[PDB]
Every structure is written in C-alpha cells, then in structure tokens.
Amino acid sequence: VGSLNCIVAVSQNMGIGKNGDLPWPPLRNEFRYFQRMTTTSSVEGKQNLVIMGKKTWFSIPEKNRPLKGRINLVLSRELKEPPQGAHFLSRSLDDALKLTEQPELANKVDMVWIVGGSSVYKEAMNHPGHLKLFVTRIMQDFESDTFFPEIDLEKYKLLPEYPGVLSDVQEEKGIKYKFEVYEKND
Ligand SMILES: NC(=O)C1=CN([C@@H]2O[C@H](COP(=O)(O)OP(=O)(O)OC[C@H]3O[C@@H](n4cnc5c(N)ncnc54)[C@H](OP(=O)(O)O)[C@@H]3O)[C@@H](O)[C@H]2O)C=CC1
Ligand SMILES: CCc1nc(N)nc(N)c1OCCCOc1ccccc1/C=C1\CCOC1=O
C-alpha cells in the first residue's frame, strides 16, 4: 500500500458542499482533475483505493458510481453492506486502512485517496503520520452547508509545485480556481 492522500475542492469560505451538491456550478475540468489524480497509479498491476463517507457516495451521479478504475470503499455505521455499485464497506477510517493491509487487498492497492466528506477529512488530517492534501482553491465565496476542516499550516507545508499539477490560475464559467498540494509528516 502506498501513500495516504486527501483531495478536495473548497471555496474561499471553506465550503465543500450544499444539500448534497457542490456549492458552485459544475466545473468540468476540475472534475477531470479529480478523476485523473485519484485514478492514476504508477505501480504496475494495482489500482488506487478511494475512501468516502456515505453522503459523498450518494452525491456522485449513478453514471459515475462506482468511480471507475478505482476500488470504491464507503464509510458507514448504519449500512449493513456496500451500497449498490460500491466495492467495500467499513465502520471507521481505522478499519478501512487496516483492510488495505489484509490479504484480500494487500497487493492490489497502490495509493489511498480520501475524497470526502468533512468528518473523514478531519480524522485523517489530525491523525499522526505522512499525509498529503490535494486542495483546489475555488477563489470565490459560495453558500454552503458543509465545510472543510482547518488546515494547520504549522504542520501542513504548501508545496511550491508538484508533478502533474498545474500551478497557474484556472477559470471555468467565470470562476477562477487554483490547485495546491500540502504535505505533513508527524
Ligand atoms: N467539494 C468537494 O471536494 C467535495 C464535495 N462533497 C460534498 O460535501 C458534502 C459532504 O457532506 P458530509 O456530511 O461531509 O458527507 P460524508 O461523506 O461525510 O457522509 C457522512 C456519513 O458517512 C458516514 N461516515 C462518515 N465518516 C465515517 C467514519 N469515520 N466511520 C464510519 N462512517 C462514517 C456516516 O454515515 P452513517 O450515518 O451511515 O454511519 C455519516 O453520516 C456533500 O454535500 C457532498 O456533495 C463531497 C466530497 C468532496
Ligand atoms: C469534482 C469535485 C471534487 N474535486 C476535488 N478536487 N476533490 C474532490 N474530492 C471532489 O469531490 C469528488 C467526490 C464528490 O463528488 C460530487 C460531489 C457533489 C456533486 C457531484 C459530485 C460528482 C460528480 C459531478 C461531476 O461528475 C461526478 O462524478
């Protein structure tokens, strides 16, 4: 099993979601960026694993459920089996990560991507160890009901560039955004 990573798109006021949707209108290339970063795996013969909470899973349109080319794990304590189209179900983030080291997955998983929501981000980010945050900064305020947790910059170093990540400002539908990578190791 390779690195542990979070990936998120967040508005200036730290919003990630509103009523099960994005706070902003669809940004097609931002979605393509999310698809590319979580799907691309260098290690031959393996796939990355995506971890998400239940509400994040049901936010994805059925057309894109499961996220293709990746192993899909859903976090829930109420569900008794993985939702339709999902691959795995765990009752805690710790259980999910431990599962990646079981023989069932031991040599199939390259990178692990936490793709939401807020509680899963928070726990991963505040758990000691080596972690990266791939953060798309939507550079406008958007009305939201779900927020990304605080990034402790004493711990998380903003990297000055990163291979495969555009450093310049993007713009879709009149909305400017930029890609960032943070890294901690504690
Ligand atoms: N902009 C972006 O980058 C992203 C946007 N989104 C949006 O963000 C919002 C997400 O809302 P949020 O409430 O954060 O959704 P979550 O994906 O966090 O769903 C939360 C549910 O997942 C389960 N769950 C969460 N953490 C754990 C855990 N550690 N162990 C076990 N079960 C767990 C619980 O389900 P139960 O009650 O069944 O136990 C909980 O009720 C949505 O609007 C979504 O559309 C989603 C992802 C990223
Ligand atoms: C592209 C958004 C994004 N961006 C970055 N940087 N990180 C993320 N973790 C992320 O969320 C991906 C899972 C959440 O997904 C959705 C959430 C709300 C509404 C729709 C979707 C899924 C869609 C819309 C386009 O087609 C899909 O599959």
Instruction: Assess whether 22 carries a catalytic annotation.
Output: yes
Ligand with the closest atom to the CA of 28: 2
Distance CA 116, CA 17 (A): 10
Spacing of C-alpha 162 from chain mean position: 17
The catalytically annotated residue of 4, 27, 30, 89 is: 30
* Atom number of ligand 2 nearest to Cα 135: 6
Report how far ligand 1's centroid is from the alpha carbon of 119 (Å).
7
Q: What's the burial of 2, exposed, middle or buried (CB within 10 Å: 0-12/13-18/19+)? A: middle
Q: What is the CATH number of the domain that holds 176?
A: 3.40.430.10
Q: How many domains does the chain have?
A: 1
Cβ-based neighbours of 160, under 8 Å, separated by 6 or more: none
* Domain residue limits at 107: 1-186
Query: If phi over 0 gives left and psi between -120 and 50 gives alpha, with beta otherwise, what is residue 174?
Result: left
Instruction: Assess whether 30 carries a catalytic annotation.
Output: yes
